[PDB]
Scaffold this active site. Sequence first.
Site, mmCIF file in Angstrom:
data_model
loop_
_atom_site.group_PDB
_atom_site.id
_atom_site.type_symbol
_atom_site.label_atom_id
_atom_site.label_comp_id
_atom_site.label_asym_id
_atom_site.label_seq_id
_atom_site.Cartn_x
_atom_site.Cartn_y
_atom_site.Cartn_z
ATOM 1 N N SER A 175 0.820 -1.380 -0.240
ATOM 2 C CA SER A 175 -0.239 0.091 -0.065
ATOM 3 C C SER A 175 0.780 1.255 0.164
ATOM 4 O O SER A 175 1.457 1.536 -0.726
ATOM 5 C CB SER A 175 -1.105 0.034 1.130
ATOM 6 O OG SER A 175 -0.732 0.561 1.643
ATOM 7 N N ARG A 182 7.445 7.707 -6.720
ATOM 8 C CA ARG A 182 6.949 6.359 -6.838
ATOM 9 C C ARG A 182 8.371 5.290 -7.019
ATOM 10 O O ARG A 182 9.039 5.558 -6.752
ATOM 11 C CB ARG A 182 5.962 6.399 -8.003
ATOM 12 C CG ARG A 182 6.760 6.682 -9.495
ATOM 13 C CD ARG A 182 6.138 7.357 -10.313
ATOM 14 N NE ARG A 182 5.241 6.263 -10.838
ATOM 15 C CZ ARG A 182 4.259 6.471 -11.613
ATOM 16 N NH1 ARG A 182 4.272 7.390 -11.816
ATOM 17 N NH2 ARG A 182 3.499 5.698 -12.259
ATOM 18 N N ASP A 212 15.648 2.975 -8.878
ATOM 19 C CA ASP A 212 15.164 2.996 -7.568
ATOM 20 C C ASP A 212 15.523 1.700 -6.962
ATOM 21 O O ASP A 212 16.119 1.831 -5.742
ATOM 22 C CB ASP A 212 13.479 2.674 -6.948
ATOM 23 C CG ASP A 212 12.778 4.583 -7.001
ATOM 24 O OD1 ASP A 212 13.848 5.171 -7.844
ATOM 25 O OD2 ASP A 212 11.443 4.377 -6.933
ATOM 26 N N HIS A 250 -5.800 -7.170 -0.551
ATOM 27 C CA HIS A 250 -4.056 -7.168 -0.064
ATOM 28 C C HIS A 250 -3.714 -7.983 0.914
ATOM 29 O O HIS A 250 -2.459 -8.563 0.395
ATOM 30 C CB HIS A 250 -3.444 -6.047 0.199
ATOM 31 C CG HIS A 250 -4.393 -5.737 1.368
ATOM 32 N ND1 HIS A 250 -5.305 -4.395 1.785
ATOM 33 C CD2 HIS A 250 -3.666 -5.722 2.585
ATOM 34 C CE1 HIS A 250 -5.850 -4.039 2.223
ATOM 35 N NE2 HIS A 250 -5.868 -4.589 3.592
ATOM 36 N N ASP A 274 0.772 -5.514 -3.105
ATOM 37 C CA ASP A 274 0.007 -4.341 -3.662
ATOM 38 C C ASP A 274 0.190 -2.662 -3.623
ATOM 39 O O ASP A 274 -0.397 -2.542 -2.440
ATOM 40 C CB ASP A 274 -1.879 -5.053 -3.357
ATOM 41 C CG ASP A 274 -2.236 -5.029 -4.267
ATOM 42 O OD1 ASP A 274 -2.036 -4.852 -5.804
ATOM 43 O OD2 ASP A 274 -3.460 -4.070 -3.978
ATOM 44 N N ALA A 288 8.941 10.287 -10.972
ATOM 45 C CA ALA A 288 9.474 8.681 -10.232
ATOM 46 C C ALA A 288 10.320 9.169 -9.243
ATOM 47 O O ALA A 288 10.529 8.346 -8.211
ATOM 48 C CB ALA A 288 10.314 8.688 -11.727
ATOM 49 N N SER A 342 10.236 2.879 -9.318
ATOM 50 C CA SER A 342 10.212 2.779 -10.448
ATOM 51 C C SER A 342 12.319 2.111 -10.733
ATOM 52 O O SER A 342 12.245 1.799 -9.826
ATOM 53 C CB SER A 342 11.331 4.595 -10.767
ATOM 54 O OG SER A 342 10.377 5.734 -10.416
#
EC number: 3.1.1.34
Lengths: 415, 415
Positions: free
Chosen positions: A127, A165, A170, A216, A151, A162, A167
């Site tokens: 989440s 979030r 990352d 989830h 999830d 990016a 990426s």
Amino acid sequence: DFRDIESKFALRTPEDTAEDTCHLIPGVTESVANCHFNHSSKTFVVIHGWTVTGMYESWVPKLVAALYKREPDSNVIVVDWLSRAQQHYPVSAGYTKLVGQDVAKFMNWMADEFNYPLGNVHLLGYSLGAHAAGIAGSLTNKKVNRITGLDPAGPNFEYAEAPSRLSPDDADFVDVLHTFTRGSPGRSIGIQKPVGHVDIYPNGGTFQPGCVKCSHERSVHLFIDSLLNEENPSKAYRCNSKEAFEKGLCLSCRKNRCNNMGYEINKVRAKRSSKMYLKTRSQMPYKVFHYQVKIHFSGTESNTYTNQAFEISLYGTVAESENIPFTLPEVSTNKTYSFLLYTEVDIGELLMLKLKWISDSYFSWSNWWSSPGFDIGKIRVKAGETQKKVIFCSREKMSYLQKGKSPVIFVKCHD
Amino acid sequence: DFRDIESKFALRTPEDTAEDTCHLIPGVTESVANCHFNHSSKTFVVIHGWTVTGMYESWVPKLVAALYKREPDSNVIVVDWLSRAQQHYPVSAGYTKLVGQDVAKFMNWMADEFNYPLGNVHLLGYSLGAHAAGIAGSLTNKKVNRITGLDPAGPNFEYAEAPSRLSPDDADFVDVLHTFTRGSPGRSIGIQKPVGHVDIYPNGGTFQPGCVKCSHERSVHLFIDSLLNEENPSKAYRCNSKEAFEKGLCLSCRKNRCNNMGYEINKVRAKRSSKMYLKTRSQMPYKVFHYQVKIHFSGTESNTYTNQAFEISLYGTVAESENIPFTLPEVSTNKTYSFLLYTEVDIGELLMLKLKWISDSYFSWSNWWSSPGFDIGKIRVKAGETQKKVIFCSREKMSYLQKGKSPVIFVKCHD
């Protein structure tokens, strides 16, 4: 201490179900004394995600038991999201980057306290916690090697940047599981985009029909059943879209078009945001086998599509299946179709194919307890695992299509 | 003429159904002129048997058509029993030796008229006609080579002398078919004794359950369907008794313990009045295949016999069978049993065995929809034709016996 962390920390132990055994205080203090830590060990860290009420996620004991029995000498650490959780949902999304800064200070701590190589660590969450993990991995001074996001969330992160979030840059390898892409992107939870290196759409990615809120809890159940059953990983297949995979033209894997699922992704990197697919069962451990077929039809009378109520059985060396009803929206003469075979058991080596087209609900009668039939034979198959390019054949009498009481059989022949 | 024959003669032709085309008059007259006869040909002679009313047997046209299509250039001759038939049944048995003297003068006629070698002739008949044929073959100056008696008569010939009956010394090879041994020997029709070199007890020899009187009519049907289907003769098996064959311990035929049926008996002579056995179907052509099984049981709880309601299925390379219910009067732990498999189709090469012990009429429930079961595996088989000493095996779960909804499967393994 540099940044006074509000989230309480817990380095967990296998003799702990749903509580805190050892609290690791923030700031550069003693860490190996009160909480046990081994340098030659595995450090898999988790983030507790979004909670509407004040509750610690009830699936933690089976989780930490599963990772402790899977890997001995494991350093599992959990943070408390409840220090900055019980507020509004976009406000919690606002606090995601602050807890990302907190875990940023965390993995910057032993980078010079213990000089960890950071090539044996794992970061995972769900989440908003997975989003904060992606932000933290975006911030990292030394690049983290692995992350398995579960999830993720929905409408808070729509077309975000990016660093804000998950990426591909990352981490060295980013994995993600979109269980719930059902509903509007601006309303429902879940992103309809290949955010990572690989992404999974289990049971089509819309929703698992096992039916709590079932979005989830699945994503942690398939992960723990993947890591327990390490000797037989679930094989995911790279394809183009949902219905193209559902027709079954993405199961070759002669080259790299398929890989495993769960913990072990066989360390394949530098991906171009490809779509990778699975089917799954419901409330028993999920190791569904896959098969695809190449059926042939014939006939000069040129009859058209009527119905989709067909059932097929399978007999093999190791196991058996009773019947699996399916749906084929197009059936005609002299045309080749294909549909997926999802099996709960390992059939193994093949002998013969059993077919039962009673169609008892959708037009079983057809005006004389029989339909104007086609001649069916030379059905080829392809296994979802390894390769099986084998040739089958039919016999004389039961090649004709007949509606109701129709025990069509098939036979292997190699000449 | 020496003995004025009262029976009218008919040398039949394939363009004749149920009438007389050419009458051959008795006495040394012209014979080859009006009735066609070839010396280099086959002479199969028949005797019309006992008729209660005044009627010629209605199965003559399909008979003479079958022998004419089976063998071209055939000399088939029939006599009229009605000249001395319509009297009392033991009085007809009294006239059997007079018509035996008549056919005695018949085969003594061309023994010096044409000097026939008498090694290419055949004599066949039923009821009292077969008995008169046996009397005539007992009388013969030169010994006749072949005779196929059909279903003989009953209480007239009880413990009779060998010239007054069928005997092994009456011919070079004597065959007989006891269709109807049911009932008292002193009342019912049929002899319960191996009167010939070989004797057949089809469907156990009591009665064919196809249900007219359904006895002698059946006999001629299996003979004509044996001679039409010459490429696949029915294989009879030498055994000791009816129930010993029914249990299935007389199907080895490693040495001479089995032979064909119908026209071709493979020319095996010098027999010791052995019992030879068959099963048969009803009102389709009768080429029932035979199989025998060696089932194994196990279990230390030592449960006993309850019921005999079991059903088994068979799947093979060539064909399939739905279900064949059977009866086993003894079932227990750690004991080996055997029962016959009579099949209407040619299964051919074997893959797997299917078993369905629902027992829906005889104790399907057994107090919790399940019975206290045994562990079943390692079932061996033996084919009724040639030999098949193959080894099978079971799997883990479905080795347990379960009453109702029990799809027990089996699998071939050779290691």
